[PDB]
Every structure is written in C-alpha cells, then in structure tokens.
Design an enzyme around this catalytic site. Structure first.
Site, PDB file in Angstrom:
ATOM      1  N   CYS A 151       0.848  -1.210   0.000  1.00 51.75           N
ATOM      2  CA  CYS A 151       0.000   0.000   0.000  1.00 51.75           C
ATOM      3  C   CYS A 151       0.880   1.257   0.000  1.00 51.75           C
ATOM      4  CB  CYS A 151      -0.936  -0.025   1.196  1.00 51.75           C
ATOM      5  SG  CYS A 151      -2.097   1.353   1.165  1.00 51.75           S
ATOM      6  N   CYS A 154      -4.796   3.420  -1.786  1.00 52.23           N
ATOM      7  CA  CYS A 154      -3.330   3.249  -1.624  1.00 52.23           C
ATOM      8  C   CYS A 154      -2.504   4.152  -2.563  1.00 52.23           C
ATOM      9  CB  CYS A 154      -2.975   1.777  -1.816  1.00 52.23           C
ATOM     10  SG  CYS A 154      -3.400   0.781  -0.354  1.00 52.23           S
TER      11      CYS A 154
END
Length: 259
Positions: free
Chosen positions: A61, A197
């Site tokens: 992420c 993300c």
C-alpha cells in the site's frame, strides 16, 4: 484489547498505523474493528512490526508506506529501503523537504492500448496489468456524473479475471491533470470512488510514459481532496514508477476492541 494507533492524511485519503505489538493472526480482525471505529478502509490499516510495515490484507500500500515514512521522520531528508508486506524486495523510500515523502510503486507487468464500449460510445484507454490488479486509464475532456454512472455499470457488467483483486477505472482529465478514481472489488461487487493506496497516481505516470515517450518527474495528479506527484520512466528494467506526496498526522491514541 488496547490498540495504540495514529491516523494520517496523505493528500485527503486517510490511513492508520498500529504502533502496539499484536499477533499477525489478529491483524485482519483488528483492522476491520479499526475500520468501523475510524471510518478508514482496511486496505489502509498497517501494522508497524519491530523498518517493517505489514498491511492488514498482506498487500503493498503506497500511501500507507508514505504515512509510515512520515511517522519515522516525525517520531525520530534521506534515501532508504523499507520491508513492506506484498513485496519480494525491500521498497525504495525517500524523505524530501516540506514533509514530502516518496515511495517506489509496483511495476506494471504489461500495458496494452484498448477501447471500452460504455453506453453506445467507444473510449480509448490504456490497460495497465499488475500482479494482483488492473487499471484502465481513460482520457476524458471532463469528468461528468453521466460518465461516472457509465463506468460503474461497465465494471459491474464485466466478468473480471480472478487474477485481479481490484479493478481500477482511472478517469483522467489530461489538460486539468485531474484523476477521478474508481476502485471495484469483484469478490464483493463493491465500488468506491477513492484512489486506494495511491495506486491510480502511479498508473497516470505509466500512462504519460506510454502516451508521450516522456519521463514523468514530479508530475502533479490532482484528485478529489488532494494532489499527489508521480515520477515514472528504463530499457529491460521496464517501468520505474514512484509517487511523492505530503502527509500530515490527523490523530494519535488508543482504540478499544473485542477479544
């Protein structure tokens, strides 16, 4: 159970990092409870293990990693590598001036120019395939409510490869450098208009490389609620892509959860 955590703002899309030590087995359950507590998406809940970051769903992420770099700068300008979940190698990270943080983003496995039929029109798009997800960068003259509904209908109606955990529809106003990101999770048929993300920002960098044969360096990608920069370029190494953005700490404290 007491969870020690901090909430961060990387360009309007908020993340949580857990500071307290827990069994890796509990991570998914803790993240789901923090998601209900704090209204932050689980994919953006990370666990700092004792430099090492484990995301609740064991994926990489970008903006959570950027939040982790901010945490390290704040908690204690330089180039270094971080161990993050969902990566075979350590991830290149940088602290820049003015609370800008840079993160290496996943390498595109392949890009293919394509067209998608939405309503009764054809839209030119770049298909960007990653290990566990696919993004479609769709150049637009402007983002409209109608276009958003067509994109929602489109992703819902398609049969998606089980390779792809998420499908991204990245509506990009090239002249305004504005991204309207849609993330679709096929498994649970959920749609969310968020640059989850910061993955879509990296996809815009790959799009720029493909479209113009020009390297991206601090190319501004505006989105709802903020801006993120993309650097993207390298013969047989393929696409080399990083995102750079400001992070501020929103809150720090203790959450109280069951078990």
């Amino acid at each position: 159970q007491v969870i020690e955590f901090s909430k961060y703002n990387p360009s309007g899309n908020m993340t949580i990092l857990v500071h307290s030590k827990h069994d890796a087995s509990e991570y998914a359950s803790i993240a789901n409870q923090l998601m209900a507590a704090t209204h932050v998406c689980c994919e953006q809940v990370g666990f700092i293990e004792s430099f090492h970051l484990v995301m609740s769903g064991n994926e990489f992420c970008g903006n959570a990693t950027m939040s982790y770099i901010h945490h390290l700068q704040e908690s204690h300008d330089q180039q270094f590598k971080v161990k993050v979940s969902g990566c075979s190698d350590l991830v290149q990270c940088a602290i820049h001036d003015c609370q800008y943080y840079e993160v290496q983003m996943p390498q595109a496995h392949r890009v293919v120019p394509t067209t998608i039929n939405m309503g009764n029109h054809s839209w030119k798009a770049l298909e960007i395939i990653y290990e566990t997800y696919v993004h479609y960068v769709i150049p637009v003259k402007q983002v409209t409510t109608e276009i958003q509904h067509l994109v929602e209908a489109f992703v819902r109606e398609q049969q998606w490869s089980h390779k792809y955990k998420t499908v991204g529809m990245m509506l990009f106003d090239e002249q305004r450098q504005f991204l309207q990101p849609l993330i679709y999770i096929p498994e649970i048929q959920s749609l969310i208009w968020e640059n989850s993300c910061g993955s879509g920002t990296a996809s815009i960098g790959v799009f720029n490389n493909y479209q113009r044969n020009d390297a991206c360096k601090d190319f501004t990608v505006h989105q709802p609620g903020g801006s993120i920069l993309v650097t993207s370029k390298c013969h047989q190494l393929g696409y080399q892509t990083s995102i750079k953005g400001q992070v501020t700490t929103v809150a720090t404290g203790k959450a109280y959860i069951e078990l």
